[PDB]
From a paper:
α-Synuclein is a 140-amino acid protein, over half of which (residues 7-87) consists of seven imperfect repeats, which are lipid-binding domains. They partially overlap with a hydrophobic region (residues 61-95), also known as the non-β-amyloid component (NAC), which is necessary for the assembly of recombinant α-synuclein into filaments. Upon assembly, recombinant α-synuclein undergoes conformational changes and takes on a cross-β structure that is characteristic of amyloid. Neuropathologically, it is characterised by the presence of abundant filamentous inclusions of α-synuclein in the form of Lewy bodies and Lewy neurites in some brain cells, including dopaminergic nerve cells of the substantia nigra.
Here we report that the cryo-EM structures of α-synuclein filaments from the brains of individuals with PD, PDD and DLB are made of a single protofilament (Lewy fold) that is markedly different from the protofilaments of MSA. Still, for each case, a minority of filaments (~25%) was twisted, allowing their structure determination by helical reconstruction. α-Synuclein filaments from PD, PDD and DLB are identical and comprise a single protofilament. We termed the structure of the ordered core of these filaments “Lewy fold”. The reconstruction with the highest resolution, 2.2 Å for case 1 of PDD, showed density for main-chain oxygen atoms, establishing that α-synuclein filaments with the Lewy fold have a right-handed twist, in contrast to the left-handed twist observed for α-synuclein filaments with the MSA fold. The Lewy fold is formed by residues 31-100 of α-synuclein, which arrange as nine β-strands (β1-9) in a three-layered structure. The first two layers are corrugated, with the first comprising β1-5 and the second β6-8. The third layer consists only of β9. Two additional, partial layers are made by densities (islands) that are not connected to the rest of the ordered core. Island A packs against β5; island B packs against the N-terminal half of β9. The reconstructed densities for both islands indicate that they are made of peptides, but a lack of distinct side chain densities precluded their identification.
Author numbering:
A (entry chain A), B (entry chain A), C (entry chain A): 31 to 100
D (entry chain C), E (entry chain C), F (entry chain C): 1 to 7
Amino acid sequence: GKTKEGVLYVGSKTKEGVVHGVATVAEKTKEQVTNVGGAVVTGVTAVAQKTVEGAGSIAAATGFVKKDQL
Amino acid sequence: GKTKEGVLYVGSKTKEGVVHGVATVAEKTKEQVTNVGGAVVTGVTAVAQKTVEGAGSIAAATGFVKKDQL
Amino acid sequence: GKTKEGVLYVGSKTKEGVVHGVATVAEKTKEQVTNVGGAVVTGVTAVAQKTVEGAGSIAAATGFVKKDQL
Amino acid sequence: XXXXVXX
Amino acid sequence: XXXXVXX
Amino acid sequence: XXXXVXX
């Protein structure tokens, strides 16, 4: 009689992998992402909601701002 | 008779992996991410909600701001 | 008759991994992240809520601000 | 930038 | 930047 | 920046 109610998971779950060789070169590059079996999570809003015979309200906001004045 | 109610997980879970060689070079690069079996979580808002015969309210906000004036 | 109610986990759980060689070079680079089986969590707001025959309210906020005036 | 892996 | 791994 | 690992 399992219940998962009002639960969240953010990130990564790994079971029993292998990764041999991951070589990477970034030269004179603005942005570079090398991801292997990983989660790179940026600037997300996620809402899960269940209501039963009730009232439920959520207000969620994310502001991600990045400036690079050179 | 398990219950998970009102629970959250953020980050990473690893069971029994291998990672042999992860070499990386960043030269004259603004941003560089090398992720292997990992979670790189930045600027997230996550809301999970269950209400039953009740009233439930949530207000959540995240502000991520990064400035680099050169 | 297990219950997890009102519980949170933030960070990392590892069981029985291996990581042989993780070499990294950052030269003249603004930002650099090398993550292996790890959680790098920054600027997150996470809310999990379960209400039953009750009233529940949450207000959560995160402000992350980073300035580098050169 | 000579990243030379050799397992 | 000569990252030379050699297992 | 000569990071030379050698297992």
